[PDB]
Amino acid sequence: LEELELDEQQRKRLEAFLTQKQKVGELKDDDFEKISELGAGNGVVFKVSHKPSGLVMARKLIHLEIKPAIRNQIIRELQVLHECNSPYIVGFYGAFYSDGEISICMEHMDGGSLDQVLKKAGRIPEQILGKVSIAVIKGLTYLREKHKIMHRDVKPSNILVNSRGEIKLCDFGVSGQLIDAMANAFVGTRSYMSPERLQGTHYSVQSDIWSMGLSLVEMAVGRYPIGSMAIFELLDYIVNEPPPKLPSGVFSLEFQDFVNKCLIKNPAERADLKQLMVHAFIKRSDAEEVDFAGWLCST
Amino acid sequence: ELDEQQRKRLEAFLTQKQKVGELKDDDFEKISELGAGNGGVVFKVSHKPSGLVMARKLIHLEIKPAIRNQIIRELQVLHECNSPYIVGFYGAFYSDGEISICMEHMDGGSLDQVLKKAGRIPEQILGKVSIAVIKGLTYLREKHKIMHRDVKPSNILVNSRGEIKLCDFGVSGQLIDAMANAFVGTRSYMSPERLQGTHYSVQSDIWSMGLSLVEMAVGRYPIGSMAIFELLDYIVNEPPPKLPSGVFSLEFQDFVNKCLIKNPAERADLKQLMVHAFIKRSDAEEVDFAGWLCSTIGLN
Amino acid sequence: DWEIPDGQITVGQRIGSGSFGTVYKGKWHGDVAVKMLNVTAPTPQQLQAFKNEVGVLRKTRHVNILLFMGYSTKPQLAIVTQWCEGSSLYHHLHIIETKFEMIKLIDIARQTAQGMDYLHAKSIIHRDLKSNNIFLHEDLTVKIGDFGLATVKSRWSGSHQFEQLSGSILWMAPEVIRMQDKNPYSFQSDVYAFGIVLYELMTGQLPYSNINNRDQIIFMVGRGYLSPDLSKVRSNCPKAMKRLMAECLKKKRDERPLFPQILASIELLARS
Amino acid sequence: DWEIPDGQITVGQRITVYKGKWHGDVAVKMLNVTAPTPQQLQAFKNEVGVLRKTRHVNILLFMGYSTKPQLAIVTQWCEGSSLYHHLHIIETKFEMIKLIDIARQTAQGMDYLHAKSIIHRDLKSNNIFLHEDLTVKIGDFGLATVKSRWEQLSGSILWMAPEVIRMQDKNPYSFQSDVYAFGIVLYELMTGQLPYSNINNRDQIIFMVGRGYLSPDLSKVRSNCPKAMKRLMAECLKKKRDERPLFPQILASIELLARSL
Ligand SMILES: CNS(=O)(=O)Nc1nccc(Cc2c(C)c3ccc(Oc4ncccc4F)cc3oc2=O)c1F
Ligand SMILES: CNS(=O)(=O)Nc1nccc(Cc2c(C)c3ccc(Oc4ncccc4F)cc3oc2=O)c1F
Ligand SMILES: Nc1ncnc2c1ncn2[C@@H]1O[C@H](COP(=O)(O)OP(=O)(O)NP(=O)(O)O)[C@@H](O)[C@H]1O
Ligand SMILES: Nc1ncnc2c1ncn2[C@@H]1O[C@H](COP(=O)(O)OP(=O)(O)NP(=O)(O)O)[C@@H](O)[C@H]1O
Ligand SMILES: Nc1ncnc2c1ncn2[C@@H]1O[C@H](COP(=O)(O)OP(=O)(O)NP(=O)(O)O)[C@@H](O)[C@H]1O
Ligand SMILES: [Mg+2]
Ligand SMILES: [Mg+2]
């Protein structure tokens, strides 16, 4: 509950977002104009301009061949995002369908994804990842406490940042129908899936913690930790081999222990959201003073 | 009018035909190729149920089964076409996209084939041919009110006995219609009135006989290497051919001239030709055509 | 390449006859049509016609051209194409007398024109277009077939021509009948044959059905004294189709329209 | 020979594939990239070279290619919908005789491809068009190769043989992996469903299918499915590729099955 609290500036930023959002109504393709291309995934995301409101927005197009009934139910389930308001969760504006593609409109993050920052830094400093760890843990706790869902797709490409210093989660499993629909395509080249989910055993938000740990190891060493191999070899490596570890020299002992407790392959012994928040690595970085904006702007 | 031998041969042929029943494809065995026309090869075959040696012609047509059945029935009139100057008919049937017409085998072949070995055919021989064709046409006209429609050297057949018989005439009205759109040839003996679409009659068969007689007399197709249209244009536009001089009697030259008059109204008819001086002389002539033929083509 | 080893093709029931050879239903990776030269001593023309048809067919990839699939040299020369279950347009119009609706009659003309346009764009002149060589398949998909006589840039069987072969008289333009020009064939003579096909579609009948004299048809059509009786066209035939048919049947080849224009006219009246 | 000049093809509505006009309706599959990479021209040359070897009614008819303006492949325009659309979007109620005939025609086209030594490598219901609701057309030869005497995972995981997913053998793709993809098509036809419909995790499907832990639930096969068809489908889906039959034998099994109805 203490992680769910916001400072004065975060409360002002959230209300300012919800105020600008209040000017938006029903979304339609005719009411949008493209600005630039924010990147691409397995799906394309455009920086767009909503003409009736004038707001800058991010529009993701998901190409699916699904029954219209399934398409409409996805739009209905995505409406839950209107109640997912947090300084660590990307704001949501609307969703609609046109030309065989489902549009998801959300808040724009000028900094981009933490996977694109890795390419513009090589490695990410430990105190920066401490703020990221705090943002991810708080965001995962918010989804579990307020909406009873997990993220199920934590990875550096789904942790977004901006010049205002904010670090928010995105692309989480808010729609049961959208999860099912996207399971048969969107083949990736790497993976952050927990070992227990890969094997079809019982899973929970612990899998998001494992995914966060692997993302932190990548952003710390500057390389994907699993194992060039194809996807199945990588998945097999995740199941069979012991987890990766952070180098012993540069990184602090607490940060190594933080990552190690995230990456325990047995999810029953893996640390949880509560234990991680009261971990020594979080408290040191929580009370610490870092200008993440300046580091993000330079990198 | 029939002689005693002519009456006998026809009776012996009708008795041979009593041995023949319904014709079927499996009841035939090939022997040799008799020759080839624009419709394909005519085959000399054997009808096992009767044993008789026949000539089998295959006519490939794509037509309605109902029209195919009417063609077979119209061809049955041939059983009532009995004459010493008419090739005999045995039967007809349909088998694998073609209508097979089985007929009397003529071991001397067609005069078209004979002309190739003979080079030319002497006048007295052609007098017996003229009588055979005129008596065949007159028989068809008076007994069945049908023209021949396709008189030419290849449709006048002969045998080692010295007989001269007409074949391939227009007995089945639907077969005439069915064969009009194909079976194109490289020469033509068609009368000028029929080419031009005007009124015609058995006069046209007389034109075709006169043209065939000139060809066999001089050993050359007398129309006009021209393709088929240019030959048809020549028949319509140019005056008819004539026999050369110093070779044939004036009666023969006058006979073919009156056959080849391009106006069918003035062209001689079967009755006028039958009392022409050429036919009168030829009928009373003793001509060993059987011996001439066998010696000319090499028959035994 | 496209040569099929002997033994893989299973020859079945006889289906009909082509301009050169006999056509059978067969089996080779499914149903096929197999056109074989069942002749012990084939003529030079029959040999060159097989070589020509394979050469022309290999240049064609279009839904309205019969699909060439392969050929065999031994034990006999054979051309393998797709099998068309609906037989030929001649069979439908003049054998079983299928009563096509006008929309389907127009669409058959449209697909035929579509295939002819494709051929002429590749400088292929069919020279034997007739309803027997228009095969049907699926829901009346038209397939133009039989390329024994076809020329490509006026060549035949991989060589310049030393003769001018000819097909069936009924679909034959007057200048092809007369054989007075050195080369009497052109895109426009194919158009004339298409016009006769249009006449079959809109009358249900072959032309000159009252004239049973082959040599009479040759002379009078060649002289321009005989032409199809356009009053036999059914009353449900659109006026624009009768006008187009009349232009395709013009006696002077220079007055006939070409297939790009023919297609535009059929697509316009089909919209009405 | 099959290159189409620049100003002949008319491009129309986008369906990537556009509906176009070149001597009638055609489908035009283009590469919108202004600068084709070597891997792009490689794939384009490979696909055209493979398509030009195909002349069969159950193979999408290749008609030509254009290199200007953009790299484009021209094929016939198919009327109707794909088998994936029929089975999983509009739920067309095919009778069993038609389901078997769709399987037969698909096997017919694949048998042709394998006789031309062509491995399709992307067989799936989305690439099987039911032209005029009657004739199977196998399309999308973007991954097709010609097997000769002499890499990242690419394709749709539902139709991938376990050895294709694993990408560990020297030649993961073979005629037998095309057979496995065909076996999944048989599963779609005889169940009306995609496999692993209860599994909503793509990486779980990859790991478990490649390890042989997960395979299609053959109990979803409808009761009207003949016994010889479920048995043929199970033999096409064998985890070990050497136990799968080849398409000459698959065709004969379907044909005998079709007579026994
Ligand atoms: C890989 N792991 S997995 O196999 O579990 N697959 C899946 N994982 C997770 C989710 C899904 C489906 C899905 C997706 C992808 C999705 C994307 C964007 C989205 O918009 C916003 N998002 C956050 C904040 C604001 C927004 F506007 C909502 C979404 O909601 C969804 O449900 C999966 F398929
Ligand atoms: C060029 N002139 S034309 O344009 O009029 N064409 C036509 N001319 C004349 C006739 C026909 C059709 C036809 C034919 C061809 C035919 C052939 C053989 C036949 O067997 C026997 N024949 C006589 C005696 C014994 C037989 F066994 C009967 C036939 O019966 C026929 O009716 C034509 F098409
Ligand atoms: N709201 C946003 N604001 C700014 N950039 C964004 C936003 N959403 C997405 N992006 C960018 O768009 C890129 C594409 O995202 P996406 O289509 O989700 O693929 P991905 O997450 O990067 N990798 P994958 O999930 O395997 O397809 C991301 O990497 C971000 O850089
Ligand atoms: N009954 C028969 N006996 C012997 N030979 C015959 C008989 N009938 C036909 N022939 C021969 O078979 C060959 C083909 O005859 P046919 O098919 O009628 O064509 P044609 O009259 O010779 N020329 P055409 O009419 O222009 O096609 C000719 O050489 C005839 O001499
Ligand atoms: N030859 C064709 N005729 C008709 N429709 C076709 C043809 N080829 C492809 N299509 C359709 O056009 C679309 C293009 O599909 P595809 O070939 O896979 O390329 P795509 O742009 O990636 N679309 P997708 O199927 O989602 O991958 C699909 O809806 C196909 O069903
Ligand atoms: Mg993402
Ligand atoms: Mg004859």
Side-chain angles (χ1 to χ4, degrees), chain B residues 23 82 117 122 141 214 286:
Chain B
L23 299 190
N82 300 285
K117 292 200 190 301
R141 168 176 188 80
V214 173
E286 216 72 46

Side-chain angles (χ1 to χ4, degrees), chain A residues 65-67 179-180 182-187 189 191 193 197-200 229-232 235-236 239, chain D residues 84-85 88-89 91 126 152-153 155 157-158 165-166 168 194 200-204 206-208 210-211:
Chain A
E65 190 174 355
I66 53 177
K67 297 190 196 184
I179 297 170
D180 302 358
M182 298 184 63
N184 292 329
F186 307 96
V187 187
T189 61
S191 178
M193 192 58 57
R197 286 183 72 194
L198 292 172
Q199 302 173 79
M229 299 144 288
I231 180 69
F232 173 82
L235 301 184
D236 206 38
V239 171
Chain D
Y84 184 100
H85 192 76
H88 313 308
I89 306 300
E91 258 69 8
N126 313 80
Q152 187 58 57
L153 197 64
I157 59 183
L158 293 187
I165 286 166
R166 290 191 300 260
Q168 290 170 337
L194 296 167
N200 50 60
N201 189 323
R202 119 215 359 159
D203 286 359
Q204 170 184 179
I206 295 177
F207 174 77
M208 293 194 73
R211 280 265 148 269

